[PDB]
Design a protein around this ligand. Structure first.
Ligand SMILES: OC[C@H]1O[C@@H](OC[C@H]2O[C@@H](O)[C@@H](O)[C@@H](O)[C@@H]2O)[C@@H](O)[C@@H](O)[C@@H]1O
Length: 223
């Protein structure tokens, strides 16, 4: 690929996008490895893939390698008109324990560290193996023209909302404001007090492989 990132927290930046070989939970594994590969980038989005094998620590995420959209700090969720995103992705195998998910952090502190937030909003486009979101399911919700199983729970002091697609969504053009709006008016999410911290798409890897997730296209448009 045009660039290869194998070390933990390996990093690429370009065209207002970034990729992080974010192997944050790798110490939970008895064995394994993972790289992220930039296939191409332009202002209109990027193309990348990641290959990994992880064994051991069955219930612990080893990594969340991601492509992130860059944006200025200090954007209040209620000031954002649109958080549109498009992604096309596919795994080269069914038999992994992993998901494919957008990860979004918000915090009242606009300078919050990018590794967490006051709140976390996940959109799980797919779920492989028996992997489960944070918390417990609260029912099926209609957001952005689709149905999702909404899970809610706490990761430490961070409240986590995970919207789970009922079947894998290998290609998706979404309006992430819809999910924030849903949460603001149905789950008491204080959107007017929160700032966008990160906006990422990637895969949480638990166990399995060697497996490859290919992102044919990833773009986001925040305005
Ligand atoms: O500081 C090293 C890198 O931190 C990374 O964030 C870590 C954070 O990742 C989330 O996905 C979540 O699963 C947390 O459990 C975990 O701590 C990363 O974003 C980079 O910005 C840093 O290079």
């Amino acid at each position: 690929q045009q660039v290869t990132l194998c070390e933990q927290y390996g990093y690429w930046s370009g065209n207002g996008y970034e990729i992080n070989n974010n192997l944050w939970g790798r110490d939970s594994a008895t064995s394994g490895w993972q790289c992220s590969y930039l296939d191409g980038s332009s202002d209109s989005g990027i193309q990348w893939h990641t290959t990994w094998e992880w064994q051991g620590g069955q219930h612990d995420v080893k990594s969340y390698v991601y492509s992130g959209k860059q944006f200025p700090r200090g954007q209040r969720i209620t000031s954002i008109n649109s958080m549109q995103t498009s992604v096309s992705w596919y795994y080269d195998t069914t038999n992994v324990r992993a998901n494919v998910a957008y990860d979004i952090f918000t915090a009242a502190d606009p300078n919050h560290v990018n590794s967490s937030g006051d709140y976390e909003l996940m959109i799980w486009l797919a779920k492989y193996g028996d992997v489960q979101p944070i918390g417990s399911p609260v029912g099926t919700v209609h957001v952005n023209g689709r149905n999702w199983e909404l899970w809610i729970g706490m990761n430490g002091n961070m409240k986590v909302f995970s919207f789970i697609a009922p079947s894998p969504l290998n290609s998706w053009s979404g309006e992430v404001k819809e999910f924030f709006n849903y949460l603001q008016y149905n789950q008491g999410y204080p959107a007017g007090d929160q700032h966008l911290i990160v906006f990422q798409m990637g895969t949480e890897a638990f166990t399995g492989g060697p497996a490859t997730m290919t992102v044919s296209h990833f773009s986001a448009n925040i305005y």
